[PDB]
């Protein structure tokens, strides 16, 4: 049942078996019923660890390829490509789940569109040429859409709106290499949360001030 699937995801998380945790939450998602805030986090955590393990491996092999024969060089390129499509297949898996089942409450719509912009950003980290330019536009469109919805329907101190602006500013800096726009987005999100700092909800206030510190850390780093 739906209950036993979420328990298996909780079990796989504690066992640090995130492939099973992602497969469990994929089955929960494919039940077409909306997911709670807890099930949203279990799905996001599972697939972030799956794609994160491929990102960390890709960065190691790619940096070795830049340093490294014509026989040891092609093997590194063949290994970087093998990890690449593993990463891209994971991103293809989540984006299909988001577009077919999860993206259609305003808090859930920005959480899922932020995921869409995140995993399209992870594709841009490994893509080149027109392939990179295509996934960059798809990441920009998902971020910008969740950006406008979070303004109209959410508080400036909400952790989901704050986390979205953190990754959106990182998108302009790490992907588009636009530090002026990256700083302006992070500073605006920080200023808006400060002006409405009285709206800090008693439960999720330690999560809001955490992201507000992260926005300042990136702002100090980018200036």
């Amino acid at each position: 049942d739906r209950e036993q699937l979420v328990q298996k995801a909780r079990l796989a998380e504690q066992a640090e078996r995130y492939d099973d945790m992602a497969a469990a939450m994929k089955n929960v998602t494919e039940l077409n019923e909306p997911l709670s805030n807890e099930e949203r986090n279990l799905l996001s955590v599972a697939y972030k660890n799956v794609v994160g393990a491929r990102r960390s491996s890709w960065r190691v092999i790619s940096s070795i390829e830049q340093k490294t024969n014509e026989k040891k060089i092609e093997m590194v390129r063949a290994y970087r490509e093998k990890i690449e499509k593993e990463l891209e297949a994971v991103c293809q898996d989540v984006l299909s789940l988001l577009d077919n089942y999860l993206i259609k409450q305003y808090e859930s719509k920005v959480f899922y569109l932020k995921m869409k912009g995140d995993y399209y950003r992870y594709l841009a980290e490994v893509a080149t040429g027109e392939k990179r330019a295509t996934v960059v536009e798809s990441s920009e469109k998902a971020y910008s859409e969740a950006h406008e919805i979070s303004k109209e329907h959410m508080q400036p101190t909400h952790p989901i709106r704050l986390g979205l602006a953190l990754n959106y500013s990182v998108f302009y800096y790490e992907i588009q290499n636009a530090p002026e726009q990256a700083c302006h987005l992070a500073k605006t999100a920080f200023d808006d949360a400060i002006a409405e700092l009285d709206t800090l909800n008693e439960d999720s206030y330690k999560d809001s001030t955490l992201i507000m510190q992260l926005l300042r850390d990136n702002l100090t780093l980018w200036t």
Binding site: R40, N41, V45, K48, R59, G163, L166, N167, I211, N218
Partner: peptide
């Protein structure tokens, strides 16, 4: 990398 949100 490592500049993004470390959690959902």
């Amino acid at each position: 990398y490592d500049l993004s949100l470390p959690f959902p």
